[PDB]
Ligand binder design. Structure first.
Ligand SMILES: Nc1ncnc2c1ncn2[C@@H]1O[C@H](COP(=O)(O)OP(=O)(O)O)[C@@H](O)[C@H]1O
Ligand SMILES: [Mn+2]
Ligand SMILES: [Mn+2]
Length: 269
């Protein structure tokens, strides 16, 4: 079977309890994870160890907190105590774990399931081929010996409008924001980088990225995490918001793809 789980955020105990509830069996089952495996919850170290150990039985996409962790590890960004990353950063296998983490995709595609996963979703300004190329471009930088320079460049909120003409720093920053930070769009598809509230509490004319018809969403289902204030609710058919805020005292949600059945694990917090 195929299981999809939203943002874990170091909530290792809840992740394992949820997987035991469905009797997840590597080799027979496959787990998809929407990213943000680390930070806020207490068990980032254990989560990375476990997910890395799954090998081909897990399909991960990186989120914004995974990238921030990489930036801290490389000395590009300062550690925040509230992220609770020190045990992971100080672990004897930190290098092995983070060098594995930075080689993971930004985007997962399964044609037989007609299923696409990214941390924040797929901007309506992208078709599938563009999304694939952009993912490949950023993944190439992250898996290279020079990834600290990319991480340092990634921070920034502009440009917020896609063009095949974008080059250099602006192109990479847009790709990163689209994959790992996007929530709301302007009517033309342009990204807003400030509102993090629920669709009902947002100011006009902002709309959820998934409320704007885009070519990927017309052909494929899309699963994503990231947007906790959405609470996994209010999406159209074919759009699956899996982040229900476990690390915030909400729940960890698992979706079995074959029957679209939900399984939920309450936060221990
Ligand atoms: N259920 C919720 N309702 C409203 N806001 C929430 C909810 N859960 C989390 N938030 C808020 O969402 C804001 C952004 O958190 P999050 O969605 O995890 O994304 P980010 O990676 O940008 O931090 C946080 O400041 C948090 O207070
Ligand atoms: Mn996120
Ligand atoms: Mn998150």
């Amino acid at each position: 079977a195929t299981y999809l789980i939203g943002d874990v955020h170091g909530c290792y105990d809840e992740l394992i309890a949820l997987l035991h509830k469905v009797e997840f069996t590597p080799g027979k089952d496959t787990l998809w994870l929407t990213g943000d495996l680390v930070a806020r919850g207490p068990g980032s170290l254990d989560v990375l160890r476990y997910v890395k150990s799954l090998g081909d039985s897990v399909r991960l996409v990186l989120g914004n907190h995974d990238l921030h962790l990489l930036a801290v590890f490389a000395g590009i960004s300062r550690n925040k105590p509230k992220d609770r990353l020190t045990p992971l950063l100080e672990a004897p296998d930190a290098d092995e774990l983070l060098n594995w983490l930075r080689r993971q995709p930004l985007l997962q595609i399964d044609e037989e399931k007609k299923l696409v996963m990214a941390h924040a979703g797929i901007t309506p300004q992208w078709d599938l081929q563009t999304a694939k190329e952009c993912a490949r471009d950023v993944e190439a930088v992250l898996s290279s010996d020079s990834y600290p320079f990319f991480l340092d460049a990634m921070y920034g909120d502009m440009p917020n409008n896609w063009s095949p003409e974008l080059r250099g720093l602006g192109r990479l920053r847009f790709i990163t924001n689209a994959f790992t930070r996007m929530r709301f769009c302007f009517p033309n598809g342009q990204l807003d980088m400030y509102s993090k509230e629920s669709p009902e509490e947002a100011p006009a004319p902002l709309k959820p990225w998934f409320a704007i018809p885009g070519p990927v969403a017309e052909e494929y289902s899309i699963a994503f995490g990231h947007w906790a204030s959405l609470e996994g609710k209010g999406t159209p058919e074919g759009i699956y918001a899996l982040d229900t805020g476990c690390c915030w005292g909400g729940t960890l949600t698992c979706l079995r793809w074959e029957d679209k059945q939900y399984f939920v694990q309450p936060s221990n917090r």
